[PDB]
Structure formats: structure tokens, C-alpha cells
Design a protein around this ligand. Structure first.
Ligand SMILES: [Zn+2]
Ligand SMILES: [Zn+2]
Length: 55
């Protein structure tokens, strides 16, 4: 597998989203905000932003 996950997933590390040691933000089962600050779409992100120049 890719260089990143080795011990299942959970455990160790720390969640920089909630601040709970054991999991990561990417493994945060409790999302929030993460609202496109480009279009304002409080759901999708730039990686999922089909918008380029507003249009
Ligand atoms: Zn979390
Ligand atoms: Zn967007």
C-alpha cells in the first residue's frame, strides 16, 4: 500500500479537526464548516469546485 497508513487507520496521531488524539482530521467522523470560501458553497471544496471564475 501507499506510504501513509500502516496500523489500520485509527489510533495514534491526532485529529486537528476536533483535537482528539487517536484519529486524524481526515478520519474525523465529525466534519464542519469546510465551506468553499471561493464560491461560498458551504459543502463542496476547491477540489470539488466546478467553478473557475465565478461563472
Ligand atoms: Zn475528529
Ligand atoms: Zn466552490
Amino acid at each position: 500500500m501507499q506510504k501513509g497508513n500502516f496500523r489500520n487507520q485509527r489510533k495514534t496521531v491526532k485529529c486537528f479537526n476536533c483535537g482528539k488524539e487517536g484519529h486524524i482530521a481526515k478520519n474525523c467522523r465529525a466534519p464542519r464548516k469546510k465551506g468553499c470560501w471561493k464560491c461560498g458553497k458551504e459543502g463542496h471544496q476547491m477540489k470539488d469546485c466546478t467553478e473557475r471564475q465565478a461563472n
